[PDB]
Design a protein around this ligand. Structure first.
Ligand SMILES: *[C@@H]1O[C@H](CO)[C@@H](O[C@@H]2O[C@H](CO)[C@@H](O[C@H]3O[C@H](CO)[C@@H](O)[C@H](O)[C@@H]3O)[C@H](O)[C@H]2NC(C)=O)[C@H](O)[C@H]1NC(C)=O
Ligand SMILES: *[C@@H]1O[C@H](CO)[C@@H](O[C@@H]2O[C@H](CO)[C@@H](O)[C@H](O)[C@H]2NC(C)=O)[C@H](O)[C@H]1NC(C)=O
Ligand SMILES: *[C@@H]1O[C@H](CO)[C@@H](O)[C@H](O)[C@H]1NC(C)=O
Ligand SMILES: *[C@@H]1O[C@H](CO)[C@@H](O)[C@H](O)[C@H]1NC(C)=O
Ligand SMILES: *[C@@H]1O[C@H](CO)[C@@H](O)[C@H](O)[C@H]1NC(C)=O
Lengths: 298, 73, 313, 79
């Protein structure tokens, strides 16, 4: 999973009277809180509490993970973006993922013009031969497509090698007819993938292919049809012709994993203007979920 | 002896003349592009400061409240 | 002994190397190739020269020892004709003078790729300068791709590679041909879907395949790589024959679709401009060409008739 | 009609989803008003086989990308 969700589920199962809530992306929320919103202390990516914060309520916008690591190092220095997260290219002037750990093969003398997003990195790391040989579908901007569709070999229930099969026969992916006549025992499978490309929980939908040039299989009409069908079924499942946005994932997490902050959103899916903490203060929030520097209280 | 004069503007500071006064000096009088305001380890200061939406501290804004310009211009 | 020649590039192990017979060498006195002379028994000398090679593996790849004694350390002098095919039969060693016991460095692969190759969005490449055409039909596609990436990393002059089919009409065979110059690269996918200006034999569209270029990496291609330039234009284009337009007489309208893009790099800006102007002059359909200098390459865009007159009294 | 035609045993528990239905909680704590979802689905279907819809695309494509990154934003600024 991630360094947090393990701790979170351990706390929830063991019932130990504090659950370290962490946002989607499975990284510790900068400002954790106690079992009843008593004392929200802020932490770092490691998972420890920063000594200089135990105040009851909510800390006044505790320092971000990038800058926490930076000031820890002070006693290379990261360049934290104005938002508090790492700049996409640290500076040897390599560039980094959205976690702090440098992207593998990106050590250069000068700043790269544009170095990969997360989905491009995952695809390339797949070609190196680590992970199931099915390329995650990447949005044009480079981030993960919300709906990821990976085929499955029906016999043995083993994932269907897609890099190799599409490399060898992408004539075979012209239409579903050809695919059936080439791989009759393969049944598609589409799920909703979060910002990190991690298959969300209990949202996979094992489609069928029996009854229905491009490249990458993310531009083939096969994938477009196979995700249009998934969104159509998702409309019935959840009324929204789309997968749950980052907000709604955070919501469901908080509701399930009881901890005092539960974000709020409305059917459009974006973060509601003002998020409120039961037994605590309210505050405006931007589209990306980060609390506005100060709004505690056209 | 002579002293050069510039619709354009002299990039170099004025001075009278011997010396080789620079020919390719006078050029476009650009427009203001930065405003900044001053208020009374530095990395710790800036880290704890910007975390609140933000000793000598300056908030220069590339486009009290004195105008300047981007470094190298 | 007495190493450090005046003119030499600057700035167990006997079995580690793969000796190659001398017949594979094309002698050429009028050739340019950096090296490191020396003036060294015989077998002890051979081991010494090979140890000296392994000492500085940055560019020593064609260590050769003679007995007429000397031993030099050439870089990979395997210039290949710019023909897409699954065989180094077109690749021929060119050396200043036939040595006696020329060896070469066994290509050592790795598990970690040094850099992140980003595939070019260009199907066609003209003026490429192939370095080492390799067959890859033996390996699997992903394993072959990994071998190809590693091959280009191990080559300090490789400025990008190509993992692609060759002779697809006959059936096609996968090859990892590494480039030290991408040349004029054209025939993109997103650009000029309508209004194309420019290959069944090869096929670079399927996912693994493409024309990967290693990151721009402004190291300046360390100064022992073979100097490479686009083939000189046989025709001379007179810039006076083309109206240069001021940037104020043009609109920046996006969503304009009757155009097509090309990149260059490789030669001084004037050379790239002449190349793109000639490329547009070949087609009577191109009408305006605009060049902008991107960091690594220069981007020339060809638009057809696109003018928006505004009328008034 | 899909429940047997296309949708198949995967990981969503159609069993549980139906056991509160005819044969509420939803995928991610999503209250589901089944009737409204079905009505919206038929709305979208009749909407997609609509002669004017094509024209909308022919116009939605035209509008500059700067004011509307994607056709959804084109639509929102048309609303
Ligand atoms: C680039 O050429 C590639 C050469 O490796 C080619 O891969 C080969 O493709 C053929 C089919 O096109 C495979 O043959 C298979 O399909 C036929 C269809 O009738 C069957 O009869 C055969 O038994 C077999 O299953 C080859 O096997 C495959 N290469 C290898 C080594 O197996 C790619 O198709 C080419 N890429 C493009 C874009 O054309
Ligand atoms: C429900 O689904 C079935 C199966 O998809 C439909 O039967 C198909 O109908 C189409 C025409 O709409 C035919 O082209 C297919 O050959 C049929 N398939 C089979 C297996 O019979 C059926 O029409 C749908 N409607 C109802 C009321 O069942
Ligand atoms: C799926 O599994 C079977 C195992 O019987 C295997 O033989 C087959 O190759 C797999 N599918 C394809 C298309 O190869
Ligand atoms: C660029 O190089 C070519 C080489 O012959 C030369 O003809 C041309 O005049 C050069 N232009 C400039 C600006 O150096
Ligand atoms: C959900 O599906 C499983 C098999 O995947 C099935 O055994 C189970 O009964 C279903 N849940 C319920 C509540 O029926």
């Amino acid at each position: 999973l991630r360094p947090c969700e393990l701790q979170r589920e351990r706390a929830f199962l063991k019932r130990e009277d504090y659950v370290p809530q962490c946002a989607e992306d499975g990284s510790f929320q900068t400002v954790q809180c106690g079992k009843d919103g008593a004392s929200c202390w802020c932490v770092d990516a490691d998972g420890r509490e920063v000594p200089g914060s135990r105040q009851p309520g909510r800390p006044a916008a505790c320092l971000s993970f990038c800058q926490l690591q930076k000031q820890q190092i002070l006693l290379y220095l990261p360049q934290c973006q104005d938002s508090g997260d790492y700049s996409p290219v640290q500076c040897q002037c390599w560039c980094v993922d959205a976690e702090g750990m440098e992207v593998y093969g990106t050590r250069q003398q000068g700043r790269p013009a544009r170095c990969p997003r997360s989905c491009e990195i995952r695809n390339r790391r797949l070609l190196h031969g680590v992970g199931d040989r099915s390329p995650p579908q990447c949005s044009p901007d480079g981030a993960f497509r919300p709906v990821q569709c990976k085929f499955v070999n029906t016999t043995d229930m083993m994932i269907f090698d897609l890099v190799h099969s599409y490399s060898r026969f992408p004539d075979a992916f012209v239409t579903f007819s050809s695919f059936r006549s080439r791989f009759p025992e393969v049944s598609g499978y589409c799920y909703c993938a979060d910002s990190q490309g991690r298959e969300l929980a209990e949202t996979g939908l094992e489609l069928l292919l029996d009854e229905i040039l491009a490249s990458t299989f993310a531009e083939t009409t096969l994938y477009r049809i196979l995700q249009r069908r998934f969104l159509a079924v998702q409309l019935v499942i959840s009324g929204r012709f789309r997968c749950p946005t980052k907000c709604e994932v955070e919501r469901f997490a908080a509701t399930s994993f009881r901890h005092p902050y539960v974000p709020s959103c409305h059917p459009d899916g974006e973060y509601q203007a003002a998020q409120c903490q039961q037994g605590g203060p309210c505050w405006c929030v931007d589209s990306r979920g980060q609390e506005i520097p100060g709004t505690r209280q056209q | 002896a002579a002293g050069q004069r510039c619709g354009y503007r002299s990039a170099f500071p004025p001075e009278p003349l011997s010396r080789p006064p620079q020919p390719r000096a006078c050029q476009r009088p650009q427009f203001w592009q930065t405003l900044q305001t001053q208020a009374q380890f530095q990395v710790f200061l800036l880290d704890e400061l910007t975390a609140r939406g933000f000793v000598n501290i300056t908030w220069k804004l590339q486009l009290r409240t004195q105008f300047g310009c981007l470094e190298g211009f | 002994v007495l190493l450090c020649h005046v003119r030499d590039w600057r700035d167990l192990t006997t079995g580690l190397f793969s000796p190659v017979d001398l017949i594979q060498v094309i002698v050429d006195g009028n050739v340019s190739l950096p090296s490191q002379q020396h003036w060294l028994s015989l077998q002890q000398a051979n081991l010494w020269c090979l140890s000296r090679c392994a000492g500085e593996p940055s560019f020593c790849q064609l260590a050769e020892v003679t007995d007429s004694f000397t031993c030099t350390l050439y870089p990979e002098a395997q210039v290949c004709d710019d023909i897409l095919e699954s065989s180094p039969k077109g690749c021929r060693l060119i050396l200043p003078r036939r040595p006696s016991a020329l060896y070469r460095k066994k290509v050592v692969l790795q598990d970690r790729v040094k850099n992140f190759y980003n595939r070019l969005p260009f199907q066609k490449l003209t003026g490429i300068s192939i370095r080492n055409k390799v067959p890859m039909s033996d390996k699997s596609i992903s394993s072959g791709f990994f071998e190809c990436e590693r091959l280009c990393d191990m080559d300090p002059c490789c400025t990008g590679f190509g993992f692609l089919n060759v002779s697809q009409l006959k059936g096609g065979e996968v090859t990892c041909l590494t480039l030290n110059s991408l040349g004029l690269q054209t025939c993109s996918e997103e650009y000029g879907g309508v209004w194309r200006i420019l290959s069944p034999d090869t096929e670079v569209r399927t996912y693994p395949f493409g024309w990967y270029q290693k990151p721009v990496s402004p190291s300046d291609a360390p100064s022992f790589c073979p100097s490479v330039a686009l083939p000189a234009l046989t025709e001379n284009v007179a810039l006076d024959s083309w109206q240069s337009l001021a940037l104020s007489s043009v609109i920046v309208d996006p969503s304009i679709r009757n155009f097509d893009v090309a990149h260059i790099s490789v030669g001084n800006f004037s050379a790239a401009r002449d190349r793109c102007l000639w490329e547009c002059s070949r087609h009577q359909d191109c009408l305006v060409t605009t060049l902008q200098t991107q960091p690594g390459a220069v981007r020339c865009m060809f638009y057809a008739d696109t003018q928006s007159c505004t009328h008034s009294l | 009609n899909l429940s047997g035609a296309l949708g198949t045993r995967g990981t969503f528990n159609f069993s549980h989803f139906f056991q509160q239905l005819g044969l509420v909680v939803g995928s991610f704590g999503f209250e589901v008003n089944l009737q409204e979802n079905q009505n919206a689905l038929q709305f979208l279907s009749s909407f997609l086989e609509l002669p004017e819809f094509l024209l909308f695309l022919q116009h939605a494509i035209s509008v500059p990308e700067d004011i509307a990154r994607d056709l959804g934003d084109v639509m929102e600024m048309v609303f």
